[PDB]
Amino acid sequence: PEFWFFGKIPRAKAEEMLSKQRHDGAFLIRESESAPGDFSLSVKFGNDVQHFKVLRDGAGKYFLWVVKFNSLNELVDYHRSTSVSRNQQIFLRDIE
Protein backbone atom coordinates (compact mmCIF):
# COMPACT_ATOMS: atom_id res chain seq x y z
CA PRO A 1 0.00 0.00 0.00
CA GLU A 2 0.82 3.71 0.01
CA PHE A 3 2.34 4.69 3.28
CA TRP A 4 1.37 8.34 3.15
CA PHE A 5 -2.40 8.09 3.55
CA PHE A 6 -3.30 8.72 7.22
CA GLY A 7 -7.05 8.85 7.00
CA LYS A 8 -8.88 11.18 9.34
CA ILE A 9 -5.98 12.25 11.59
CA PRO A 10 -6.67 15.72 12.98
CA ARG A 11 -4.49 18.62 11.80
CA ALA A 12 -2.91 18.95 15.27
CA LYS A 13 -2.06 15.24 15.40
CA ALA A 14 -0.48 15.41 11.99
CA GLU A 15 1.64 18.29 13.21
CA GLU A 16 2.69 16.37 16.36
CA MET A 17 3.62 13.33 14.19
CA LEU A 18 5.52 15.19 11.51
CA SER A 19 7.39 17.43 13.90
CA LYS A 20 9.28 14.27 15.07
CA GLN A 21 10.42 13.33 11.56
CA ARG A 22 14.06 13.79 10.64
CA HIS A 23 13.74 15.04 7.06
CA ASP A 24 12.13 18.05 5.51
CA GLY A 25 9.55 16.90 3.04
CA ALA A 26 8.31 14.01 5.19
CA PHE A 27 4.56 14.18 4.60
CA LEU A 28 1.11 12.73 4.85
CA ILE A 29 -2.22 13.14 3.20
CA ARG A 30 -5.14 13.41 5.58
CA GLU A 31 -8.89 13.64 5.28
CA SER A 32 -9.78 17.21 6.16
CA GLU A 33 -12.17 17.81 9.08
CA SER A 34 -12.78 21.50 8.00
CA ALA A 35 -13.57 20.56 4.33
CA PRO A 36 -15.33 17.25 4.86
CA GLY A 37 -14.58 14.86 2.07
CA ASP A 38 -11.57 16.84 0.84
CA PHE A 39 -7.88 16.19 1.52
CA SER A 40 -5.06 18.12 3.05
CA LEU A 41 -1.29 17.61 2.67
CA SER A 42 0.91 18.16 5.73
CA VAL A 43 4.68 18.40 5.38
CA LYS A 44 7.65 18.83 7.67
CA PHE A 45 9.87 21.81 7.08
CA GLY A 46 12.44 22.70 9.66
CA ASN A 47 10.77 23.40 13.02
CA ASP A 48 7.37 23.87 11.31
CA VAL A 49 4.73 21.72 9.66
CA GLN A 50 3.12 23.26 6.57
CA HIS A 51 -0.34 22.46 5.33
CA PHE A 52 -1.64 22.56 1.72
CA LYS A 53 -5.27 22.16 0.62
CA VAL A 54 -5.61 19.53 -2.06
CA LEU A 55 -7.67 21.51 -4.53
CA ARG A 56 -10.15 20.01 -6.94
CA ASP A 57 -11.60 21.10 -10.24
CA GLY A 58 -14.73 20.67 -12.26
CA ALA A 59 -13.42 17.37 -13.74
CA GLY A 60 -12.44 15.95 -10.39
CA LYS A 61 -8.67 16.53 -10.74
CA TYR A 62 -6.38 17.13 -7.82
CA PHE A 63 -3.87 19.96 -7.62
CA LEU A 64 -1.89 22.24 -5.28
CA TRP A 65 -1.09 25.16 -7.59
CA VAL A 66 -1.61 24.91 -11.30
CA VAL A 67 -0.56 21.42 -12.64
CA LYS A 68 -3.33 18.87 -12.30
CA PHE A 69 -3.55 15.13 -11.60
CA ASN A 70 -6.10 12.36 -11.95
CA SER A 71 -5.35 10.91 -8.50
CA LEU A 72 -3.82 11.77 -5.15
CA ASN A 73 -1.21 9.17 -5.99
CA GLU A 74 -0.09 11.05 -9.11
CA LEU A 75 -0.08 14.41 -7.30
CA VAL A 76 2.11 12.97 -4.55
CA ASP A 77 4.52 11.33 -6.97
CA TYR A 78 4.84 14.57 -9.03
CA HIS A 79 5.76 16.43 -5.87
CA ARG A 80 8.55 14.00 -5.02
CA SER A 81 10.59 15.81 -7.69
CA THR A 82 8.84 19.27 -8.04
CA SER A 83 8.56 21.51 -4.96
CA VAL A 84 5.25 21.67 -3.03
CA SER A 85 6.16 25.11 -1.77
CA ARG A 86 6.51 28.39 -3.66
CA ASN A 87 8.71 29.86 -0.85
CA GLN A 88 11.31 27.05 -0.33
CA GLN A 89 12.29 23.90 -2.26
CA ILE A 90 10.44 21.08 -0.50
CA PHE A 91 10.26 17.63 -2.15
CA LEU A 92 7.89 15.01 -0.74
CA ARG A 93 9.34 11.87 0.78
CA ASP A 94 7.73 9.14 2.81
CA ILE A 95 7.76 9.19 6.58
CA GLU A 96 10.26 7.04 8.38
Find out whether 83 and 16 touch, Cβ atoms under 8 Å: no
d(CA 68, CA 78): 10
Beta strands in the chain (DSSP E): 26-31, 39-45, 48-53, 55-56, 62-63, 68-69, 93-94
Counting the structural domains of the chain, the total is 1
Resolution (A): 1.4
SS3 content of the chain, % helix, strand, coil (to 5): 20, 30, 50
Q: What's the domain range around 1?
A: 1-96
Q: What is the CATH number of the domain that holds 9?
A: 3.30.505.10
- Identify the bridge partners of residue 38 per DSSP, sorted by sequence position: none
Structural method: X-ray
